[PDB]
Amino acid sequence: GVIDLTMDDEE
Amino acid sequence: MADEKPKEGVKTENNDHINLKVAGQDGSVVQFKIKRHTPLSKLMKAYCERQGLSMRQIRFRFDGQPINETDTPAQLEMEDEDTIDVFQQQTGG
């Protein structure tokens, strides 16, 4: 489990 | 966090989250967990942060087709575990 990304808000 | 999350029998995770991995020419690979409308650029910049690359020096392909930063998991029709390929690219300036 590497990248959990965001640029949108998380959900 | 640093752990691996289960996903068996789960198509999509809460509000259209799916995972893709990007693999280089040299067999180096990082995965990312991403949302459907979000551009491919987000994982690409994340790839640079984690795996030590410059964003203009790497370009992504899907089965001999260029995929562009404005392209997307929706547009390329990426899976819950997609696999995307990298070529190291001469940009001429």
Side-chain angles (χ1 to χ4, degrees), chain B residues 24-64:
Chain B
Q25 300 181 249
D26 64 303
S28 300
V29 58
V30 91
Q31 78 70 228
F32 336 73
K33 180 161 52 169
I34 182 159
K35 305 102 79 168
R36 199 165 185 257
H37 73 236
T38 307
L40 75 89
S41 58
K42 182 65 267 176
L43 66 117
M44 184 186 281
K45 197 146 58 184
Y47 190 24
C48 300
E49 293 171 349
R50 279 82 187 199
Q51 281 303 136
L53 314 170
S54 280
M55 67 179 176
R56 78 199 308 260
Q57 297 299 348
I58 55 175
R59 291 286 85 168
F60 296 171
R61 294 175 181 187
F62 181 61
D63 205 44

Side-chain angles (χ1 to χ4, degrees), chain B residues 18-22 34-36 38-40 43 60 62 67 71-84:
Chain B
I18 51 169
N19 321 250
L20 85 173
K21 77 196 79 179
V22 166
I34 182 159
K35 305 102 79 168
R36 199 165 185 257
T38 307
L40 75 89
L43 66 117
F60 296 171
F62 181 61
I67 56 178
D71 298 332
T72 75
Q75 285 174 220
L76 191 64
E77 312 178 74
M78 295 177 191
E79 289 181 64
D80 61 299
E81 291 176 62
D82 227 72
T83 302
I84 300 300

Side-chain angles (χ1 to χ4, degrees), chain B residues 4-29:
Chain B
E4 190 68 72
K5 194 181 182 182
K7 59 181 288 290
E8 308 83 73
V10 182
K11 298 179 174 61
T12 49
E13 172 168 294
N14 49 239
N15 200 52
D16 304 302
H17 313 204
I18 51 169
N19 321 250
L20 85 173
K21 77 196 79 179
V22 166
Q25 300 181 249
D26 64 303
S28 300
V29 58

